[PDB]
Symmetry: D2
Subunit: 219 residues, 4 copies
């Protein structure tokens, strides 16, 4: 390594607006980048209790925390100490659309995250505004280059009650602050994000993520 | 009318971020709500010169300015004095996605607009980041009710340098502040938006829009 | 006109498969191309009674029948005597997707139509498989050139029972058989298609369409 | 297993039309359902030489051939001896859209496949009509139930000459012929399909696929 330590701290601040509802959320966590694991304690500072499903926000709360094999270029760890930023569009199957971005920096053993999240057109009686989501199912992000920019497309899904699912398509564009960072070839990153615990109105949430990069079958 | 006068003034302020670029734009205009015509002078206050096509922002700079026939319920004019707000998603064909919102209020003979505009995933060499757009073509917005909310869907297109077109799909949701405003039936609203004048880097722009509601064929 | 007559006959045969159900439908009608009006009597020869809403098929049952103004190039009437063909994708909001095609020829005062229609992934309890549709709302097709081919994109909507709408996005590509047919500029074509009458299971249906091309506002 | 043997034979016949081009392709192959592996020799009977990229057709040439772990319900193997059928929509990022379906039956140790493939709106200068595809990248299909039907959504990509990728979204619906077959819970199926060899104009092609079901991270 050198720039990134086996054990890193995580500082985050999110501000956003969904369907006209404003909110500010603080995060404090720790993680093991080389093992692709991280945990974070979230505290809603303004706008709580959120009138929408907390789950839509969780992936906004850093691909640095992903276990990359030696045969696959790790664009994220190679982006530090300078850092990088990402933008994302979350297209839900019922018309709800969100965009999010995060500017990631590093100071010592801590990653700093300036996050913004905006969402519109969620149906009033949909699972998001009615808070009927249970969790995101694990996923496999497809990483590839588009017009010189590392891009990740994902078939995501939120589990609802009675074993039904609510689909969302993700497209994330990753850009290192520093020019010249070597781009990886087409690959994958498996993810599993989960809310380990939370209070009744999700004003306090403990989040966790495990991610591993790979080259898919047959390797 | 009653609450809305034949000649209204327009005050507007937009704050946004497209592809990581922050910006603030002020607007000052006038319009004839009953004739579906309005004009406005825009001035970039922060973030100038914008590194993207000014055209993506223009429709963000009020359906009250649309000529509604007596046989079609005018949800927008009926939303005042209290006012209304809208949310929109602009999905471009090359992956770029924007979401915008406008909270509209009225004090005297002036409409006030609190607008926000966010855009992500625009390709570096796409027409937006390369400023190769010329104008939005006229359009026809399809207005209908979805889950109790007035919704407008549009097949939009930007004429590009070179004579080709760049498609964008619009979905706007409109919500009156006052509960109980009668919802209209399925109808249409023709639009024509144009930048009348502008300086080199569009730090100063004069915008115009003409809109008329109708019931399509055969009527 | 010269090639196309004010009064034309229409012969058509459609073969298709929706959600695994095969069918063949024959049609005979008449229309006035220069007035953009046509009518046709349809009869299900094989596959009756259809297990899905007949409405999804109706637009598959010729833009020659559209009233074009002198200032807009009429790509369709100019395609005969040789004729033309079109392909179309109908993407419904619930995942249902259909593609269709029509190879159009002419002999004397009659247009012949070789139509094919295929639909997949319609939810078992959706409005299509449950036959809960009432009609297509009138529309405005946006005509433009894409990669050298005349294309028509449309925000279509099926009015459903219960005062709700079911959206479908249309993309039709039109290609003249003979080279040198001048391509028109960006324009619109208003449409209004309706099933005038039908028997209980829609084995026999009378269809009608009125269409007018135009330049949109302010012209 | 019982109904399905460790070694099975595959008999297939595809009939289709892409951008107006008709074709008939026969297939003969073998595979090991429990190992999730299969191979097949294809031969174009009518329509050769195909004017479009052969790669768009390959996934149309049976999830029975997928290694399913004991902890995940195998809807496919439990569908025999009666069999099952599937429908698929392939939405390419440039507007090209294809639908396909396969009715799969079994007699002895041989699977019989009645396949149909139709495609429309492929741009003349797109990679499909210009035959610039190299291969499909490996993928991970997300399996879940929508309206009582097993559904698979996939973020697919074709590697193109020149190192870039061309995206396509897959949605396949799977339906057992026999009522009752237990529906699985949300899961995944990794895929890797490759053309092992082919002659000049792809009139003869040797295809191969490897697939393995799994529960994602952390398991």
């Amino acid at each position: 390594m050198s720039a990134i330590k086996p054990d890193m701290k995580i500082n985050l601040r999110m501000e956003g607006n969904v369907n006209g509802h404003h909110f500010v959320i603080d995060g404090d966590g720790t993680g093991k980048p080389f093992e692709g694991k991280q945990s974070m304690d979230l505290e809603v500072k303004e706008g709580g209790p959120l009138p929408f499903a907390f789950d839509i926000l969780t992936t906004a709360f850093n691909r640095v925390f992903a276990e990359y094999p030696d045969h696959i270029q790790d664009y994220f760890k190679q982006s530090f100490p300078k850092g990088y930023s990402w933008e994302r569009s979350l297209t839900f199957e019922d018309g709800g659309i969100c965009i999010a971005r995060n500017d990631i920096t590093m100071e010592g053993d801590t990653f700093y995250n300036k996050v913004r999240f905006h969402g519109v057109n969620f149906p009033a009686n949909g699972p998001v505004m009615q808070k009927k989501t249970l969790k995101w199912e694990p996923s496999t992000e497809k990483m590839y280059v588009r017009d010189g920019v590392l891009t990740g497309d994902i078939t995501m899904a939120l589990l609802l009650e009675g074993n039904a699912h609510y689909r969302c398509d993700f497209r994330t564009t990753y850009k290192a602050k520093e020019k010249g960072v070597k781009l990886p070839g087409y690959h994958f990153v498996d993810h599993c994000i989960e809310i380990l615990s939370h209070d009744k109105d999700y004003n306090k949430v403990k989040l966790y993520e495990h991610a591993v990069a790979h080259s898919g079958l047959p390797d």
